[PDB]
């Protein structure tokens, strides 16, 4: 059982992003495997590991591996221990005294971690960088002023107490209204400016849940479905408005290729993760296609010839094959391997 | 290092549904982790493990799980001894004295198996269990299920004969499927493309009988038959979808048609994701086979000049159907996160 004693502050009771200062570097601490226990005065119990924060702090890294005994530091700044079990037997009540007697027995080598030092006067800064914490693998130039565009979304949303999934949700439904109600109606610029608009939904999405410390399995799952469901939904209503008013038949029947394609290069990787092997290989992803896709329909529906749409459409055809192959082919060689 | 003795025998070598019964024994007792010795007269090496079979018998269980000391039996037929280590210190180069010794000396309860004695006479029976044992069939009468293994034991004999492999099986039934689907049914042949599809989508069986039959179960093989499963039926529909938006002339159809299969992607995609995430969730009203089914027939039917009517409304069911099954996966993967949290 490992135990993790923080010191009450005035600092810990302000709310960040949603939650409180306190709640947030408790919940950090669980995700590292430790009961925390609040003190004004420590009153330590029998466990194994011990880690012992004194000063108010934001901790920004994600994931935090603790093994044996080390410690703690934020450029010069010193802002916990990690003492075993052994420990126990030396704290007499005298903070500054059984520390250092610990480290004049205990030679520990200094271990550097991603964290800020709370303090009144910074605390947008804290804000700032806990922001910049969450991104990645993003897009570095572009990532750095990326997080700068999708900042305020975040921070409003975190701010107005509005959940991931909510925005998710609400994200694919206006996907499916630009895609199944304009694009039917032969509005393709339109529809491609309201898909655009609620596409980037799931970054969002990805970002609050991060954020607000909801993550999981349910959330991963969400945002892939919801991410299959608009894709799916958006090539549907391609297909529709060609086959019928757009008066296409050939790039209507490349957009249906498209569609059970993507399906099934989707339906791959999810299989095979499925049956535990991986598969994280191929030229296409989700993103790049939509933009390609997106951009020559709303071209096209701005007056740009139909061909180009058409060239477009057998391309990402053709991506989605290959990539099909790719990951069939590595499946292969993984259970080949696994079978040997 | 577990080690098992199986005594050579004259039938050993007479091949069965493409193997022989000796390479089927030895390959069986290798699934259960054992080093397999055959032996015409027994020299014992130092092992943890003693496994003994004595009478030629042709093993039908599946999974067989050996824990401590025991005696194999099947259906009151003795087919085998477990000894431990402690038999090298008594075998003394008689069999049936040191067995019956160890026998006295030692008590072990009896484990029942799925086994049979092979003689000359019986062999057309062990094929035929073998074989029922090997297919499954989904909700089908004791009086079908006899009579469905009865009409694909020439088949699973033929293509045991042949050397096909279970993979070639899967991918050509696919391809027929296919043929089917996106020829047939765009040229307006809405029968010829069903009969074409039915013919070649019992090979999903066939696969899987021979997969199972020939000793190769693995992953890349459930992971093929799901595959081209998807494929297959995305095909189905991606055919009646094009033939009926261009000259089949109803866009209603074709419509329901285009909804259905992306539900239908939408249904396979959430087991699939759920499963990769590693909960489960195998409920549905709709089951594959039956849907297939309902599909091919109304499909036919309007084929033969059935008005198109029908298969609106087989659309319209399925669809919903589809619907509410995603209802049910989507809620109770819910509902598996919540509680994991809890
Ligand atoms: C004039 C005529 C021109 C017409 C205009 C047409 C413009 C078309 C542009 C297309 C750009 C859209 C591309 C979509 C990007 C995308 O979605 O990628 C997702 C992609 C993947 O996101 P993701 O798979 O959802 O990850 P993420 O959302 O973080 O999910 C991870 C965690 O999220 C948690 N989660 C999620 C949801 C939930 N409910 N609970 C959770 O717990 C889970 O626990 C997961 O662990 O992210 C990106 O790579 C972003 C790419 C950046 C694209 C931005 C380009 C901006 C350019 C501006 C162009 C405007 C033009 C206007 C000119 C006029
Ligand atoms: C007059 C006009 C009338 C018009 C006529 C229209 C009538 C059409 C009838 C359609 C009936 C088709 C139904 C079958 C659907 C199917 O494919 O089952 C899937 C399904 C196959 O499931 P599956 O996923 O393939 O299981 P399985 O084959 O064992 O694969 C599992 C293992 O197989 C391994 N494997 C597989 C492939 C591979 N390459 N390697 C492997 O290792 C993997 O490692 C897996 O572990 O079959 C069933 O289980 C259901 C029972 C079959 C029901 C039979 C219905 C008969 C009705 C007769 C009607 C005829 C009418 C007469 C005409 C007049
Ligand atoms: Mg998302
Ligand atoms: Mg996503
Ligand atoms: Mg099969
Ligand atoms: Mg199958």
Same mark, same amino acid.
């Given at each position: ?8 502050? @005035?600092?810990?009771?302000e709310?960040?992003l ?9 919940k #950090?601490?669980?995700?590292?495997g ?42 010069? =700044?010193?802002?916990?221990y990690? =003492?075993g ?5 030396? =704290? ?19 271990y550097?971690?991603?964290?800020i030092? %709370? ?6 800064? $804290? ?5 910049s914490?969450?991104?990645?693998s &993003?897009?570095?130039? +572009?990532?750095?002023?990326?997080? $700068? ?11 107005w ?14 996907? !499916?209204?630009? +895609?199944?109600?304009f694009?039917? !109606?032969?509005?393709?610029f339109?529809? #491609?400016?309201?898909i ?11 970002? !609050? ?7 999981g ?6 945002d ?12 549907? &209503? ?8 757009? +008066?296409?038949?050939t790039?209507?029947?490349?957009a249906?290729?498209? %569609?059970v ?10 299989? $095979? @993760? ?5 598969a994280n ?19 096209? &529906? ?5 061909w ?10 053709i991506?989605?094959?290959? #990539? ?13 391997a696994?079978?040997?």
């Amino acid at each position: 059982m490992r135990l993790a004693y923080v010191k009450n502050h @005035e600092i810990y009771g302000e709310k960040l992003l949603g939650l409180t200062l306190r709640e947030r570097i408790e919940k #950090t601490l669980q995700r590292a495997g430790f009961d925390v226990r609040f003190f004004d005065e420590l009153s330590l119990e029998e466990a194994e590991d011990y880690l012992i924060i004194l000063e108010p702090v934001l901790i920004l890294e994600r994931d935090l591996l603790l093994e044996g005994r080390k410690i703690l530091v934020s450029d010069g =700044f010193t802002v916990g221990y990690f =003492f075993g079990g052994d420990f126990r037997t030396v =704290f007499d009540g005298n903070l500054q005294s059984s520390i250092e007697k610990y480290l004049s027995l205990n030679n520990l080598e200094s271990y550097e971690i991603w964290a800020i030092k %709370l303090s009144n006067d910074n605390l947008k800064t $804290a804000e700032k960088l806990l922001l910049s914490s969450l991104i990645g693998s &993003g897009s570095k130039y +572009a990532r750095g002023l990326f997080a $700068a565009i999708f900042l305020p979304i975040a921070r409003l949303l975190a701010d107005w107490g509005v959940s991931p999934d909510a925005v998710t949700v609400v994200g694919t439904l206006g996907v !499916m209204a630009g +895609a199944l109600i304009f694009y039917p !109606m032969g509005q393709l610029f339109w529809g #491609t400016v309201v898909i655009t608009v609620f596409v980037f939904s799931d970054i969002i999405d990805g970002l !609050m849940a991060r954020l607000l410390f909801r993550e999981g399995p349910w959330g991963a799952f969400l945002d892939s479905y919801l991410d299959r469901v608009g894709d799916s939904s958006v090539f549907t &209503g391609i297909v529709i408005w060609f086959f019928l008013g757009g +008066a296409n038949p050939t790039i209507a029947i490349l957009a249906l290729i498209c %569609l059970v394609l993507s399906s099934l290069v989707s339906y791959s990787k999810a299989r $095979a @993760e499925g049956l535990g092997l991986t598969a994280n290989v191929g030229i296409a992803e989700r993103s790049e296609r939509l933009v390609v896709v997106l951009v020559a329909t709303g071209l096209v &529906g701005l007056g740009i010839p139909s061909w180009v749409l058409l060239v477009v459409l057998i391309v990402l055809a053709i991506a989605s094959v290959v #990539t099909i192959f790719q990951r069939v082919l590595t499946v292969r060689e993984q259970a080949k391997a696994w079978t040997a």
